[PDB]
Each structure stands twice: as structure tokens, then as C-alpha cells.
Amino acid sequence: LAEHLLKPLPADKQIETGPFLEAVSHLPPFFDCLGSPVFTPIKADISGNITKIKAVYDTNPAKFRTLQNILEVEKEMYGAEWPKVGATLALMWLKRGLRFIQVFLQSICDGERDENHPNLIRVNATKAYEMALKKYHGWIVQKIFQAALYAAPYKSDFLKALSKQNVTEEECLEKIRLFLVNYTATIDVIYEMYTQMNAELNYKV
């Protein structure tokens, strides 16, 4: 995770598409080692979105040099169906999965815990879901997340699974904190871009 850091934001706060996709494509694999088949559809959604954006990018790397480029070009390209189309729509849902990972990881690092059951990650996962995904899910998908939550490893095993490696828990969390710097900054910029472009949508699934 400290092996595949996201680049820092350039001065103009424009995110290069190529480098961005490469960076985040290292994230899906971490779902395989949460030790449950329950997490496979979650991996699939994040991968699929990354793959959707990559495919739009590949058609014209220069036209789609930056994430901003993607949104402005596709807006012009699709008139009235935008923002509910193309790579704009893929990235709208990618950012939410990425924000989820962000909030979950920051929560853990901040020493947030259920005092009653302290070696679990339920409370961190629950917060991340509430902050990133919950308002865009109908009640059925919510009840599904609730169930999926019990497949979560212990905090202790999860951190041991990320050092996959001769390292203490505190060392491991320091590494995650370093990763969260440019990660958070980058996601914050993508979210800000959806707000300025008016490209954010609120439909539930």
C-alpha cells in the first residue's frame, strides 16, 4: 500500500487519467485477502468501473488526458444523457468505492473502535459505508451490506493480511497513514470536480 502510492496533486489540481488508473488498479487485489467470497462482487464493481474508464481513455489518451477532460468532453459528446453515461458514470461510482476505502482506512488509523468488541472492524466499515455509499442504496442493498459485514476479518488479522511482511501493527498503520495522504487528496479533488461540473447524481440502487 506504501508500494503503490498515488502521485501528489499537481499545482493545477488536474488528475492525469493514465497514472490515476494504474494506481487504483492495485486496490481490487486487497479484496481477495479479506478471506471471503462475499467480497468478490465488491472487487468486480471497482474493477469494472476502472476498466470502463480505461476503455474510454484508450480511445483518445490526449483528449482524455485528465479526469476533468473526461467529464467536459463527455458532457459535450452526449448532450442530455450526461452525466448518467460513459466514463463519467463509471467514475461517479468508482469515487464512492474509493471514498469508502478511504474512510474505512482513516477510521482504523484514527483508533476508532467498539469498546465492547474492540478487535473487530464493524464500526469502521459501518462508518465508511454511511459516509460513502449508504445514501445511494435502496433498502435491499443496505440489508445485504449488513449481512456482508459479518464476513469482515478481525482488525488484527486484516492488518496482518496487508503486511503480506515482517512488521508490527503500529508500523503497518503508519504505512497506511502515508498512503492516505495523496489518496484522500486525490479523491477529494474528484468529488470537488463532480460538484463543480454538476455531474453528481443521487439515484439509489
Name the binding residues.
45-52, 137, 203
30, interface contact from ligand CCCCCCCCCC, ligand CCCCCCCC, none, CB < 5-8 Å by kind: ligand CCCCCCCCCC
Shortest Cβ distance from residue 11 to ligand CCCCCCCC (Å)? 25
Per rule CB under 6 A, is residue 73 in the interface with ligand CCCCCCCCCC? no
Q: How far apart are alpha carbons 45 and 97 in whole angstroms?
A: 9
Residue number, nearest CB to ligand CCCCCCCCCC: 30
Q: Which of 13, 22, 30, 157 binds ligand CCCCCCCCCC (CB under 6 A)?
A: 30
The smaller minimum CB distance to ligand CCCCCCCCCC, of residues 154 and 191, is found at: 154
Task: Give the x/- contact pattern for ligand CCCCCCCCCC in 134-153, rule: CB under 6 A.
Answer: ---------------x--x-
Shortest Cβ distance from residue 27 to ligand CCCCCCCCCC (Å)? 6
The smaller minimum CB distance to ligand CCCCCCCC, of residues 49 and 88, is found at: 49
The smaller minimum CB distance to ligand CCCCCCCCCC, of residues 14 and 36, is found at: 36
State the SS3 of the chain.
CCCCCCCCCCCCCCCEHHHHHHHHCCCHHHHHHCCCHHHHHHHHHHHHHHHHHHHHHHHCCCCCCEHHHHHHHHHHHCHHHCCCCHHHHHHHHHHHHHHHHHHHHHHHHCCCCCCCCCCECHHHHHHHHHHHCHHHCCHHHHHHHHHHHHHCCEHHHHHHHHCCCCCCHHHHHHHHHHHHHHHHHHHHHHHHHHHHCCCCCCCCC
- Residues that bind ligand CCCCCCCCCC in the complex, under the rule CB under 6 A: 1, 27, 30, 34, 101, 104, 125, 149, 152
